[PDB]
Amino acid sequence: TRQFLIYNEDHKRCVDAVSPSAVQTAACNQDAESQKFRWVSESQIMSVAFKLCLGVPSKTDWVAITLYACDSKSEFQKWECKNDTLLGIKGEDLFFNYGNRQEKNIMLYKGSGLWSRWKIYGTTDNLCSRGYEAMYTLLGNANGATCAFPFKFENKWYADCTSAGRSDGWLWCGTTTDYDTDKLFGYCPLKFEGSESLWNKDPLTSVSYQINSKSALTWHQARKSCQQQNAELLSITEIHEQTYLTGLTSSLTSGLWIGLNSLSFNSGWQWSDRSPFRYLNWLPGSPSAEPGKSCVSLNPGKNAKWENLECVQKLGYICKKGNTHCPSQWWPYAGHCYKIHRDEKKIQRDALTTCRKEGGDLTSIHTIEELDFIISQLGYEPNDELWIGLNDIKIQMYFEWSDGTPVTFTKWLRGEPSHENNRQEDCVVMKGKDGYWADRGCEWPLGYICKMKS
Rounded-to-integer distance, Cα 254 and Cα 246, Å: 13
Strand 427-431 and strand 185-187: the pairing is unpaired
Would you state the torsion angle of the CA atoms of residues 384, 389, 393, 398, taken in this order, to the nearest 10 degrees?
Answer: -100
Q: Is 448 exposed, middle or buried (0-12, 13-18, 19+ CB in 10 A)?
A: buried
Superfamily of domain 331-453: Mannose-Binding Protein A, subunit A (3.10.100.10)
Rounded-to-integer distance, Cα 198 and Cα 235, Å: 18
**HEC assignment per residue over 130-169:** CCCCCCECECCCCCCCECCCCEEECCEEECCCECCCCCCC
Q: Hey, what amino acid is at 139?
A: L
Rounded-to-integer distance, Cα 89 and Cα 32, Å: 26
Q: Hey, what amino acid is at 66?
A: T
Rounded-to-integer distance, Cα 212 and Cα 54, Å: 36
Name beta bridge partners: 282: 306
Sign of CA dihedral 255, 257, 259, 263: positive
3-state DSSP assignment of residue 349: helix
Angle at 448 between CA 443 and CA 452, to 5 degrees: 125
Domains 195-321 and 331-453 share a fold: yes
CB 205 within 8 A of CB 219: no
**Is CATH 3.40.50.880 the classification given to domain 195-321?**
no
Rounded-to-integer distance, Cα 320 and Cα 1, Å: 24
Resolution (A): 2.9
Sign of CA dihedral 298, 300, 301, 304: positive
Strand 446-453 and strand 305-308: the pairing is unpaired
Rounded-to-integer distance, Cα 103 and Cα 373, Å: 69
Strands of 218-304 (E only): list them.
256-261, 270-271, 295-299
Strand 256-261 and strand 295-299: the pairing is antiparallel
Rounded-to-integer distance, Cα 336 and Cα 309, Å: 42
Query: What are the backbone angles phi and psi of residue 300, rounded to the nearest 5°?
Result: -70, -20
Rg (CA), the chain: 29
CB 348 within 8 A of CB 442: yes
Of residues 148, 189, 143, 157, the one with CA closest to residue 170: 189
